Amino acid sequence: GNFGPYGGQNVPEILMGALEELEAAYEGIMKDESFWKEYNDLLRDYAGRPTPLYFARRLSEKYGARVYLKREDLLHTGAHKINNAIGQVLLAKLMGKTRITAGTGAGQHGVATATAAALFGMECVIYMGEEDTIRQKLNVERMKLLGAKVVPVKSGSRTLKDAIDEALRDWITNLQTTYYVPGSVVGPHPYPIIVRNFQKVIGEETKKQIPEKEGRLPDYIVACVSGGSNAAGIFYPFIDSGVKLIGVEAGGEGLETGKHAASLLKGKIGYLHGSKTFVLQDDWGQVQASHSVSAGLDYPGVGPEHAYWRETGKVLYDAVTDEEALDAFIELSRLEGIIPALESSHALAYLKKINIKGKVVVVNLSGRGDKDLESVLNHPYVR
Amino acid sequence: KGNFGPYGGQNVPEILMGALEELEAAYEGIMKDESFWKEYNDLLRDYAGRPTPLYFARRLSEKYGARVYLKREDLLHTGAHKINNAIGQVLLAKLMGKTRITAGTGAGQHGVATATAAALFGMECVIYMGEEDTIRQKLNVERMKLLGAKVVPVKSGSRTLKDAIDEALRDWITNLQTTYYVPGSVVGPHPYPIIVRNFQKVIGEETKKQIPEKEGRLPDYIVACVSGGSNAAGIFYPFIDSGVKLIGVEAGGEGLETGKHAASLLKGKIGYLHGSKTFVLQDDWGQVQASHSVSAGLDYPGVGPEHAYWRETGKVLYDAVTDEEALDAFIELSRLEGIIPALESSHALAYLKKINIKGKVVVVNLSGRGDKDLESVLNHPYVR
Ligand SMILES: C=C(/N=C/c1c(COP(=O)(O)O)cnc(C)c1O)C(=O)O
Ligand SMILES: C=C(/N=C/c1c(COP(=O)(O)O)cnc(C)c1O)C(=O)O
Ligand SMILES: Oc1ccnc2ccccc12
Ligand SMILES: Oc1ccnc2ccccc12
Ligand SMILES: [K+]
Ligand SMILES: [K+]
């Protein structure tokens, strides 16, 4: 589970037995026709796959380009997270586990996990930073109705990083019964591989859909990147194809302000939540608090596969600010009638940063922005 | 003809007759135009997300000893079947040269769907909403603002859907040259009930193609909630006279014998409402009465004339469930399947407990998702 020098299994020793068990089970289902039948049936009828690739005519006219939106916002629960949550909770049920735990920032992973746990009849305990239980309270309501226990985390920054800390402590305390579901491609092997392999359906669909619209591969594919699961899913089938793959990190108040979540652009090599990867840290190796207007991107690390792609030049990375993402959120609502997630709005904001006159561009619309409605309107820049 | 047996017609002030004949003429022109349906079908597929899946609800099927399938209209863009009609009508408005859209809304799903379509086509949009539904469906009020629409709250009358539609029709009458009125249901003067039903019948045409690949035959039952009746008409129409038992479920409110409900077909009388001769909740003196329902989307005192005709000729069966039965089905689908249904659709799901379906194949129209209803459902005394 190494992507060049990145990745690995950097965990307390007690977890190695659990990770070896998970790796053996996963390798078992990768050749199991019955797993992929039930999983693909649920993706189609329960989640709503395949998602359409939508020609955004008014957006295209504004930029003089051909802009297509991969509509992951149309999935059940409203975000790409459901592709991963269904697959992993199914794997957990097949392994004999009876309990699910996870951390969540925007609440989209928590809702998707609680949804899969209700579908498969499993106990579910979701950890979420206290600050995020307010900015994304609508998702807290959904989780409780779906039968999950929501535990607010008041430690540290009280956001995603600290929720994951608590979920990992829960997992270690409950290894007998509990399967830990990471929401992104960050974690000890085999988790980054498992999550990416559940999300690459996005890129595989996109790869079959775009020739039907333009007769060729796109010029650009743009996706937002915090941990990196939605971007890994759409990028993976296109690696080394010649398409320009652009991952967009959260620039927060600005890359020079110290208030951002741009791990690849501003972090250093380090260890976080099981992975050797790029992490925002001070000069003494202490992990720093991240910041973003988007709770989903508010995380100080990045997936090890993206650190490897950045190093080898297979994917290009940049960042946009809070204000640029807010402008793109408003722009898509007005021009196309689609309210995007504030996470995905970072990708849409990057349309202003590339020379795309006459170019074919696919933007990964990773989720819908109903959860962000209150925080956008109350933001001082929008007011 | 615009008449479903004795129901329907164009019972409107004279000032609207000209606009309705122009609308009927324009609609007949596009009914044979392949350039219209190519653009409309492409938008349904890539923008709204059609076709929607037919989902086998395994845990729900186990509870009732049946084979229960959900038609997942909740997975459409904006989260409800209303988008099918709103896209088609705003497209018609574009081809007619209109520049402004107006409508009324109850649950906010039609207001959001209409504002969404107006944004897509770059049109001015003005939505009217009852003041009560402004506070009970506040999530949809915010969506409409960011989509670029103006939302006018209505404090008149019962401050719900009926009064909002009144104001929207008043808006249309005073803006007849630039404004296209988008009804949210199969209620209104001809040709609107036909137009709305012909946009919604894609639900049933898809269902008719999907159910044989799951069961090799037609279902025993198809169940859908009914207020105005557009989602039920959409799924029922391709199945009329097919031998399938078609069941429309009206809002029973606090009980059919309490006077606090919205069951127009079961407890209304023949009357005129918003252009249609149909069944309307009224007193013995012919005065329309206020409806009531825990669901804002079903809180309407009339019903579409095609459903009045279907009930009279026996082609569809109609019944009701109470507010409490709807809330139970809302919680049940959330816990058992991980699907949070609209409170409107929950009336159809609650009816699974009211018929003998042991060993039967049942399709339920899941007309929307219920994220808009979470605050209302939790704070309800029966749930608390
Ligand atoms: C942190 C969360 N959200 C992640 C997220 C992200 C960022 O996660 P990835 O970088 O793993 O795609 C992007 N888009 C949407 C709609 C998201 O919900 C969470 O839901 O817990
Ligand atoms: C009254 C509205 N909609 C009602 C509605 C209904 C009732 O409308 P029809 O009887 O026309 O299907 C059913 N299902 C959902 C999800 C709904 O939102 C409105 O949004 O204004
Ligand atoms: O484990 C996780 C759950 C939700 N979101 C996450 C984002 C980045 C890294 C890990 C995550
Ligand atoms: O005209 C309408 C707009 C929205 N909803 C409606 C529900 C029932 C009957 C008419 C309606
Ligand atoms: K990050
Ligand atoms: K009614």
From Swiss-Prot, chain A:
Cofactor names: pyridoxal 5'-phosphate
GO cellular component, one term: cytoplasm
Keyword Amino-acid biosynthesis: yes
Biological process, per Gene Ontology: L-tryptophan biosynthetic process
Enzyme class: lyase
Keywords, alphabetical: Amino-acid biosynthesis, Aromatic amino acid biosynthesis, Lyase, Pyridoxal phosphate, Tryptophan biosynthesis
Sites of N6-(pyridoxal phosphate)lysine modification: K81
SUPFAM superfamilies the record matches: Tryptophan synthase beta subunit-like PLP-dependent enzymes (SSF53686)
Superkingdom in the source lineage: Bacteria
Pathway in which this enzyme or protein is active: Amino-acid biosynthesis; L-tryptophan biosynthesis; L-tryptophan from chorismate: step 5/5
Annotated EC: 4.2.1.20
Catalysed conversion reaction: (1S,2R)-1-C-(indol-3-yl)glycerol 3-phosphate + L-serine = D-glyceraldehyde 3-phosphate + L-tryptophan + H2O
Gene3D superfamilies found in the cross-reference section: 3.40.50.1100
GO MF annotation terms: tryptophan synthase activity
InterPro entries assigned to the protein according to its UniProt record, in alphabetical order: Trp_synth_b_CS, Trp_synth_beta, Trp_synth_beta/beta-like, TrpB-like_PALP, TrpB-like_PALP_sf
Cross-referenced HAMAP family: Trp_synth_beta
Record's subunit section: Tetramer of two alpha and two beta chains.
Protein role: The beta subunit is responsible for the synthesis of L-tryptophan from indole and L-serine.
Family note: Belongs to the TrpB family.
Protein name: Tryptophan synthase beta chain 1
